[PDB]
């Protein structure tokens, strides 16, 4: 049978983020590596392609030997799995005012940084724009239930929740091997919208 069961969550940074975007001119003082934002609100974001790729590249290290990642995320060549079983979304910074209620001035910090040669011992400085610590982001993840979907949904959820177990151990962001990660998940509820399929056995697999 048919349903769509989304995965609501607040995503919480415990170190910063860095997700870059199209390169722009840096007028000296200006930051060399600006974070991607929302062009309407001028507010940071995690684009949905940066989570669909980061979770897939993380589960490809776990479920390497391919036929379950391909049915969860998609595979263009295989006829069974073009556009199959998952839809992500952006991450729209829910606590834009709990940051002000915690007391903060601007939503992105500018981490200064450098590079030191091993011959000249000469510096080479960078400025990395970063989404600040303990921001939350409205994360949600549609997982569509269909006819071919049936009888394997039990191993689409010890993988999705084995995937969100991985993002709290790998970085989710650029320059993640120097901090810039440590994404945590909270309020990880699995409701249901447009469907007749209960979720109240799944909701204790997560929480």
Partner 1 sequence: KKEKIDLFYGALLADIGKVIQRATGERKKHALVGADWFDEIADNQVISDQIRYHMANYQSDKLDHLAYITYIADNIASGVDRTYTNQADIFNVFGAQTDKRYFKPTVLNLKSKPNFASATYEPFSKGDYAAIATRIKNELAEFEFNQVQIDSLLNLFEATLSFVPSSTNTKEIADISLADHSRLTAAFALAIYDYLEDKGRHNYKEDLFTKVSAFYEEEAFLLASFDLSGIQDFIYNINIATNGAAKQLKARSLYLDFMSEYIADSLLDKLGLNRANMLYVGGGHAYFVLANTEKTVETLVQFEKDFNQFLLANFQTRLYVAFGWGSFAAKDIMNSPESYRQVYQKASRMISKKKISRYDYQTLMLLNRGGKSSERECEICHSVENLVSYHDQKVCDICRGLYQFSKEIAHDHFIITENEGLPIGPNACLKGVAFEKLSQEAFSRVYVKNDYKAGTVKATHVFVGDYQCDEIYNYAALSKNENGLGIKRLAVVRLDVDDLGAAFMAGFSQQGNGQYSTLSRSATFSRSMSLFFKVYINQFASDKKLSIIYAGGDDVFAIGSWQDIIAFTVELRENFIKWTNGKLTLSAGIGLFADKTPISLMAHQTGELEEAAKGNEKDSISLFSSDYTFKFDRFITNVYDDKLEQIRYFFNHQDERGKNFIYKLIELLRNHDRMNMARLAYYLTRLEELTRETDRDKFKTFKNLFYSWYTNKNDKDRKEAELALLLYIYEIRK
Partner 2 sequence: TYKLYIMTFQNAHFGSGTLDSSKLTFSADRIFSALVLEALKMGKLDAFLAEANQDKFTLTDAFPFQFGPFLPKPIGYPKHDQSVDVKEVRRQAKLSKKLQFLALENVDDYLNGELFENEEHAVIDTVTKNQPHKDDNLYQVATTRFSNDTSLYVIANESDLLNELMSSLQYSGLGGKRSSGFGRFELDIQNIPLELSDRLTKNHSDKVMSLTTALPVDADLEEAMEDGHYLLTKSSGFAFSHATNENYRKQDLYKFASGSTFSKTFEGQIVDVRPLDFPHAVLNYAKPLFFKL
Q: How far apart are CA 71 and CA 75, in angstroms?
A: 8
Q: How far apart are CA 3 and CA 144, in angstroms?
A: 6
Contacts of 14 (CB under 8 A, 6+ apart): 133, 134, 182, 183, 184
| Position among 8, 124, 146, 191 found at the interface with partner 2 (CB under 8 A) | 146
Quick check: 126 binds partner 2 (CB under 8 A)? no
What is the β-pairing status of strands 8-13 and 3-4? unpaired
Q: Which is nearer to partner 1, 26 or 62 (CB)?
A: 26
Residue 64-103 contact track with partner 2, rule CB under 8 A, x = bound: ---------xx-xxxxx-xx--xxxxx-------------
Give the nearest distance from C-beta 46 to partner 2 in angstroms: 10
Give the nearest distance from C-beta 22 to partner 1 in angstroms: 7
| Position among 109, 113, 138, 144 found at the interface with partner 2 (CB under 8 A) | 144
Q: Which residue shows structure tokens 């290290």?
A: 61
């Amino acid at each position: 049978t048919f349903a769509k069961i989304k995965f609501s969550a607040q995503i919480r940074l415990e170190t910063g983020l860095h997700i870059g975007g199209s390169d722009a001119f840096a007028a000296i003082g200006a930051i060399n590596s600006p974070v991607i934002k929302d062009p309407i609100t001028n507010l940071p974001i995690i684009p949905g392609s940066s989570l669909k790729g980061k979770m897939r590249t993380l589960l490809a290290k776990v479920y390497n030997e391919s036929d379950i990642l391909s049915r969860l995320f998609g595979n263009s060549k295989d006829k069974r799995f073009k556009m199959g079983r998952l839809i992500f979304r952006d991450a729209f910074l829910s606590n834009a005012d709990e940051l002000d209620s915690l007391g903060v001035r601007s939503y992105t910090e500018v981490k200064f940084e450098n590079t030191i040669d091993r011959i000249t011992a000469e510096a080479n400085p960078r400025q990395i724009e970063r989404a600040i610590r303990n921001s939350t982001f409205d994360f949600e993840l549609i997982y569509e239930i269909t006819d071919e979907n049936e009888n394997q949904v039990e191993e689409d959820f010890k993988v999705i929740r084995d995937g969100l177990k991985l993002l709290e151990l790998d970085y989710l962001g650029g320059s993640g091997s120097r901090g810039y990660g440590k994404v945590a998940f909270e309020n990880l509820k699995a409701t249901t919208v447009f469907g007749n399929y209960d979720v109240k056995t799944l909701n204790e697999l997560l929480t």
